[PDB]
Amino acid sequence: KHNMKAFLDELKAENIKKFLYNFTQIPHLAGTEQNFQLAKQIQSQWKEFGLDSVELAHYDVLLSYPNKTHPNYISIINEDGNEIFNTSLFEPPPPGYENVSDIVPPFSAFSPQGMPEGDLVYVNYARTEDFFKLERDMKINCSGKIVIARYGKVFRGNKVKNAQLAGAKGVILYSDPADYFAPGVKSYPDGWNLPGGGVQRGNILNLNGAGDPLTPGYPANEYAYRRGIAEAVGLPSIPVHPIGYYDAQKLLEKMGGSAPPDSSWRGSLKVPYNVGPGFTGNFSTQKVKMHIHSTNEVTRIYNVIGTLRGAVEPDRYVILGGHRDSWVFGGIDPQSGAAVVHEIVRSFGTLKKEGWRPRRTILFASWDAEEFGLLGSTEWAEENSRLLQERGVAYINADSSIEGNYTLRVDCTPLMYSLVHNLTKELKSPDEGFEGKSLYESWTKKSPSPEFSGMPRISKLGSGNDFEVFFQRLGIASGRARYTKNYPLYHSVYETYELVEKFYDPMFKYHLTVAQVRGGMVFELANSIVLPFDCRDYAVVLRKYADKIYSISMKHPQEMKTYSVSFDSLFSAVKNFTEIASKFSERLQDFSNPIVLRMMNDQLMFLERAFIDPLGLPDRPFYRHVIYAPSSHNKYAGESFPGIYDALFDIESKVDPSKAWGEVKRQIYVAAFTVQAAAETLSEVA
Amino acid sequence: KHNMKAFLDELKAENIKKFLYNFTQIPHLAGTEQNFQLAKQIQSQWKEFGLDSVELAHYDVLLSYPNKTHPNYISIINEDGNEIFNTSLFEPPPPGYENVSDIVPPFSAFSPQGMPEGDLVYVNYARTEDFFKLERDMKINCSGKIVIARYGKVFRGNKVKNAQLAGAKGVILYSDPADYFAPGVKSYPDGWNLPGGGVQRGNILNLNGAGDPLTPGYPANEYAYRRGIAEAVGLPSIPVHPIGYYDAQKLLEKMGGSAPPDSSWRGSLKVPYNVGPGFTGNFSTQKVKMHIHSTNEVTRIYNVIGTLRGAVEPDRYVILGGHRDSWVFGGIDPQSGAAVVHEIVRSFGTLKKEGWRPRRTILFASWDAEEFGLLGSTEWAEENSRLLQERGVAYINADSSIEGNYTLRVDCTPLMYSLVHNLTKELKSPDEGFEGKSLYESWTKKSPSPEFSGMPRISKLGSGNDFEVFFQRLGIASGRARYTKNYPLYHSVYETYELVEKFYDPMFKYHLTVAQVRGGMVFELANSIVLPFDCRDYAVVLRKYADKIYSISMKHPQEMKTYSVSFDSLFSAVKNFTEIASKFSERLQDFSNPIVLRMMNDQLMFLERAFIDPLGLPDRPFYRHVIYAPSSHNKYAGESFPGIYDALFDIESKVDPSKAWGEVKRQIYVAAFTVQAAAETLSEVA
């Protein structure tokens, strides 16, 4: 028969391996010819595999590249203007790739041009709290200084936003061995650690969901009206560049001024980690000079969109999407995920060739320019927003399949928790010591839930990947899964096929397990008669998030008294959601009537949709989900009740407490209303 | 059988008459006890009539009332400060009502308080072009002057906005016999004309769709966070008051300064209609002084919401709504419409008692506080926006059933044109000389289409009534119909039951015809297996609107050359919409499969929805429909392609033509994209 087991059994580790090798022999940088050719290859293969239609959707978006004849670098310059030390012009290429063309040298995408010269200040991870510590506690002024920050902890775009607001005139990002060199493992090529010459590429935008910087709200098609550069969304105002730890050592070793405030500011290099500003006595007249000559350029990008039409509900879409563009070879990010998507399409197509079709339409996407700000997925979702609004059942992301080899990682809407628990109980664990056990068993043992005995940890969605437009802008139930650790070579030339094959997943069994999870989720979402969402799981978390935000507010009891700040309405809404969801579940379990079913399937599908506020969150119009947004301090992390959270954040420092607490009360009202409105979508319809 | 004819035949003119009498014996001002009692009466009766559920939905919104012990009036004041002439404190009540309590005296709702004293400037209708003529051509400066404007031509809130932007310190509105006294007809009580002591009440807000001034975006429920008054939406900054033409004569007769520029500035009073500023030589030291003491007050309002649950698609809503609050007796506005709604509910309920139910759910609404800015309908739609978004088939308004006795007036989305043509061909004409003919025949003869021989005129929707939130904010297909002229007593104490019974519709046959049209539209929308919308009619008008906006732009050929302004993308989108709609129509006609049907019904229902832009129009976030918005110069009138229209308006006067024409190009792109996106909702779904 054609059931989920047939689909799952058709997936093969050796196919995922062959596809990964095929996708990682040359760089596939967004906007390059190589990446367009790979798009055409994937289009051809998805057609071969049996999809009903496979098209390219192209857009012309703002990208950023170094100038090939005017390289980016950083110097220490003496008082005479002699550059006495220069950072590297490229990463030493790995064995057998020393003759590979078109490896983009390390750079921070979308940096403006400039040659700022000045004194260094070391800012730890450049987090909001690191700048609070510098200004407020240490009285160190970053204004007109060049800041040097270690990568880690938060999205690099937030570091740059923080540095710019502190008054910095430039930012140097570096990888500290504390964060990118695991003890007892060798550097690439002899292990999976970052060598001293390795460097992390990546964009430094603050788009807040906008997509292409020049066309927020609308797809960057052939007749698009573009903003001028000065009005573009999210671009940094100061030059930025990344370096490795051999080069960082040379910039940090001379640092003087103030000592690091505590051990959490010290990395692993043999330097004092002095904050500065500037260098110790003998070197006080030396400065650091950046030379950044990259250019932003409107460039064509190509998504591949594959359709497998539903037999019964072709106007309901379950979407499996992940990106295809890479910084260099993309051995993990994204090709470990793209290879898994490729094998999932192959398996679905095998069933289709035998006469099967899923109940609902499945869309498969190979997104372009994810690395430059989620551009491909976001432009396509802007172009198709009305179709997605009214027809989108779910989005399953499919970027990197592995970031470790220890256990499963799942981040998803509460609506998918039950689906994920049930599916993983039917899959085999690939882990050593768990042979013959379920993936649910191994995952729950290795990654226990912090609140529930005998359950595994599932995280909320943050951002920094292609589900952002679907989840936080459009309110379509979204999820992701991969294998994880209890990674060093991220965005470096060393992230190759060999890295994966030798050190992460030699048998491709973790890749196969991830294909089973992502593919099984898609299968159930596209084929189950009743959509596999449990609204009651949203009720449970909403109470947890309400308790959490109330607890933050209760750090300020006097102000809550003074300004009459009550969470009563939010708890009332959550209580109402809990009751209504319980009754809806009874009806769903207790209802031959396809209209009641589809009416009920529409209530399930539109439930995530009901958490959207069309006015957006404050100053972030494309983050419209009221329960979840990317943290304003770290795009990778999710924040719950973000509008109330941001209203409360650092509120003791606000000069007008009446106004600040009034805005907290406004956000409580918006959240209580949105939770009650979403509950009411589950009430009897008439 | 139970079919449309059974529903139509059950409607009775004598019932509409009895209900109108019942609703108009005392005032029903929004926020008063009288209007709450009438709400409870309607709730009880709709239950009696057979509705499944009938509830009150209440909100606490900003209303405005005169101060009962400190009356509003206007004076001419001499140099010593003696008030030598005072405007009336109330309208002389009509025969038999001279002892009726609680008649609100004439005032402009939401006027701020003040006692401004100054020189008059007469500004004709206070339209945008009237102020252009004053400032630009006549060099008359309104700054610090009191402006006197005649009612007519545009919504009174636009007049006040225009006066405020001209620098006026107050506005006097008056009814000129030119506009409110039809030749050869007697003043009330002996005819339907406005007497010299009659005065038009009405609000002077500029809400642009916001609803309650204090809670834009969210319902004004018990825990709502309110804006402070200074941040409220739409309130006027200068005092305003309305007067009748006996009082206007006394203010205008002394006017000096400049002569009226031409005859279009002259009304019918025996005065020169001099523009001013100020009075002629002998009276130059006299001034005009306003005394306004009204107060804005958060007040509870009550909508009645009646549900008749659908038998097959209970999660699809067809809404018949109209308001219940009146300025005084509401003999025409709104009770002539409310009485018709009441009889429609009675007739549907008669069928329901016999075992019938409509295919889809019908919701019936008696809205409160329409006269204070569409507040009741808009707060309820804000509270229920997700349900309405995803389930709203159509909204049929039901305010005044008559404004004349000549022929039918219909304003509606193009999606309802075919429905209206077909329905009116099956209804009897009530007109003298057309006995035995169809309403379609009489209407088409009396009100021919300007573009099509043998068709009647149907207008686009403007605003100034309760369909605004449903149509321009939420994108639900909307329509309205009433009897019209080829009205003088509007919002005056003289607008009574006797006015209607004696002068407008003694037999109640025009009311019955309107009940047949509104009720028949609701019946077909709620019962037809395929929704009665023809997408091809949208294609035809979109081409007409594109031709229109291109023609406006082509008044500036040099600028279009200089800034490369092309409408090619918009015409391409319209061409695509035309083709795709034609193919969709073929499929609809050519498709036993209830999923294909409902998939197709969803494509029909979401087609109006697809013209919504979630970012709204510039500076008007609640006007989200890209094809239709209320004119920025006159809330009552609809404007097509409003974003392009406003970008082009008076563009020759803009100081930075590059920026202005760039914004025209941006709006062309938004419109072309939205039309193409709406077309694509009608494509095959997969």
Ligand SMILES: *[C@@H]1O[C@H](CO)[C@@H](O[C@@H]2O[C@H](CO)[C@@H](O[C@@H]3O[C@H](CO)[C@@H](O)[C@H](O[C@H]4O[C@H](CO)[C@@H](O)[C@H](O)[C@@H]4O)[C@@H]3O)[C@H](O)[C@H]2NC(C)=O)[C@H](O)[C@H]1NC(C)=O
């Ligand atoms: C969760 O669901 C419950 C329903 O089970 C829902 O309860 C509703 O609460 C509101 C607000 O508390 C109630 O509102 C009251 O309605 C009555 C008329 O029915 C009014 O008379 C009340 O107003 C008086 O009292 C107020 C409070 O002291 C005064 O401010 C006011 O001036 C009046 O004197 C009041 O508006 C409503 O009746 C219930 N609905 C029910 C029980 O069906 C609750 O709102 C939901 N939670 C959320 C967050 O939506």
Ligand SMILES: *[C@@H]1O[C@H](CO)[C@@H](O[C@@H]2O[C@H](CO)[C@@H](O[C@@H]3O[C@H](CO)[C@@H](O)[C@H](O[C@H]4O[C@H](CO)[C@@H](O)[C@H](O)[C@@H]4O)[C@@H]3O)[C@H](O)[C@H]2NC(C)=O)[C@H](O)[C@H]1NC(C)=O
């Ligand atoms: C109305 O529907 C039609 C479909 O019938 C749709 O036609 C589309 O028009 C676009 C834009 O004109 C076409 O875009 C082209 O696509 C090809 C690849 O297929 C590209 O190579 C083209 O780019 C080249 O040429 C450009 C113009 O000179 C250059 O600016 C560019 O740099 C490249 O050299 C171009 O992007 C598209 O192929 C068709 N789609 C079809 C025919 O299926 C039209 O867009 C719809 N109208 C609206 C308003 O949407």
Ligand SMILES: *[C@@H]1O[C@H](CO)[C@@H](O[C@@H]2O[C@H](CO)[C@@H](O)[C@H](O)[C@H]2NC(C)=O)[C@H](O)[C@H]1NC(C)=O
């Ligand atoms: C990746 O695999 C693809 C698909 O097999 C290879 O592309 C094919 O290459 C052969 C030999 O050059 C051609 O005859 C086919 O037309 C190609 N098919 C396509 C593009 O669909 C490609 O060579 C492989 N790439 C690498 C680096 O191994």
Ligand SMILES: *[C@@H]1O[C@H](CO)[C@@H](O[C@@H]2O[C@H](CO)[C@@H](O)[C@H](O)[C@H]2NC(C)=O)[C@H](O)[C@H]1NC(C)=O
């Ligand atoms: C670091 O790089 C710079 C730039 O290439 C070197 O400085 C240049 O040296 C050349 C040849 O000696 C001169 O003609 C240029 O005028 C110099 N340019 C600048 C901007 O100074 C520099 O020598 C390098 N430093 C080290 C230590 O290798």
Ligand SMILES: *[C@@H]1O[C@H](CO)[C@@H](O[C@@H]2O[C@H](CO)[C@@H](O)[C@H](O)[C@H]2NC(C)=O)[C@H](O)[C@H]1NC(C)=O
């Ligand atoms: C996950 O699996 C559980 C266990 O089978 C499902 O819960 C059962 O669902 C059936 C059918 O509705 C009910 O009859 C049982 O009473 C349920 N058992 C329980 C709650 O213990 C559950 O629906 C599945 N989740 C999905 C499909 O999302």
Ligand SMILES: *[C@@H]1O[C@H](CO)[C@@H](O[C@@H]2O[C@H](CO)[C@@H](O)[C@H](O)[C@H]2NC(C)=O)[C@H](O)[C@H]1NC(C)=O
């Ligand atoms: C309007 O009609 C209503 C409905 O018939 C009248 O209200 C009823 O009045 C009688 C006699 O006072 C009561 O016994 C009923 O309880 C009322 N029914 C309701 C409110 O549903 C009302 O009197 C009429 N108003 C006027 C001005 O004629």
Ligand SMILES: *[C@@H]1O[C@H](CO)[C@@H](O[C@@H]2O[C@H](CO)[C@@H](O)[C@H](O)[C@H]2NC(C)=O)[C@H](O)[C@H]1NC(C)=O
């Ligand atoms: C217009 O109305 C005003 C206010 O009632 C009248 O002026 C008042 O007259 C009384 C009694 O003569 C005085 O005690 C008040 O001081 C006056 N108030 C003001 C504000 O002037 C006025 O007489 C009326 N004018 C006409 C022509 O009837």
Ligand SMILES: *[C@@H]1O[C@H](CO)[C@@H](O[C@@H]2O[C@H](CO)[C@@H](O)[C@H](O)[C@H]2NC(C)=O)[C@H](O)[C@H]1NC(C)=O
């Ligand atoms: C209005 O009435 C016309 C005339 O009956 C309807 O058009 C017919 O619809 C039927 C059924 O789909 C077709 O078989 C005919 O070919 C149509 N005749 C035409 C176009 O002349 C039309 O659908 C009705 N409009 C509605 C229901 O909105």
Ligand SMILES: O=C(O)CC[C@H](NP(=O)(O)OC[C@@H](NC(=O)c1ccccc1)C(=O)O)C(=O)O
């Ligand atoms: O521009 C954006 O929003 C993100 C672009 C780009 N996304 P990516 O490198 O493909 O993926 C981020 C990557 N990050 C993580 O998984 C992660 C992030 C923080 C901590 C632990 C793991 C992922 O989600 O797979 C980036 O982070 O540079």
Ligand SMILES: O=C(O)CC[C@H](NP(=O)(O)OC[C@@H](NC(=O)c1ccccc1)C(=O)O)C(=O)O
């Ligand atoms: O605040 C608002 O938007 C409108 C409130 C209020 N609406 P209304 O008096 O009930 O109805 C306006 C009324 N106006 C017209 O029909 C009309 C308006 C201009 C020209 C000819 C007819 C109608 O739509 O029935 C008003 O116009 O004062």
Ligand SMILES: *[C@@H]1O[C@H](CO)[C@@H](O)[C@H](O)[C@H]1NC(C)=O
């Ligand atoms: C890159 O640098 C070269 C060499 O100095 C210069 O001529 C060219 O303009 C630059 N290219 C850009 C800015 O795209």
Ligand SMILES: *[C@@H]1O[C@H](CO)[C@@H](O)[C@H](O)[C@H]1NC(C)=O
């Ligand atoms: C930091 O430095 C500059 C002076 O160059 C000054 O303008 C700015 O206000 C300083 N900030 C603080 C907090 O001292």
Ligand SMILES: *[C@@H]1O[C@H](CO)[C@@H](O)[C@H](O)[C@H]1NC(C)=O
């Ligand atoms: C794979 O798992 C083994 C065993 O726990 C571990 O020693 C190794 O470090 C893992 N590899 C990676 C890349 O995490």
Ligand SMILES: *[C@@H]1O[C@H](CO)[C@@H](O)[C@H](O)[C@H]1NC(C)=O
């Ligand atoms: C109305 O006017 C009276 C009498 O002058 C005054 O005492 C009262 O405050 C006013 N009421 C208001 C402003 O609501």
Ligand SMILES: *[C@@H]1O[C@H](CO)[C@@H](O)[C@H](O)[C@H]1NC(C)=O
């Ligand atoms: C109108 O009058 C005031 C002077 O009282 C002045 O400030 C304003 O600029 C004037 N406007 C014009 C156009 O003359």
Ligand SMILES: *[C@@H]1O[C@H](CO)[C@@H](O)[C@H](O)[C@H]1NC(C)=O
């Ligand atoms: C009713 O119609 C007649 C005949 O045309 C006309 O004389 C009269 O003025 C109409 N009444 C109103 C209120 O328009």
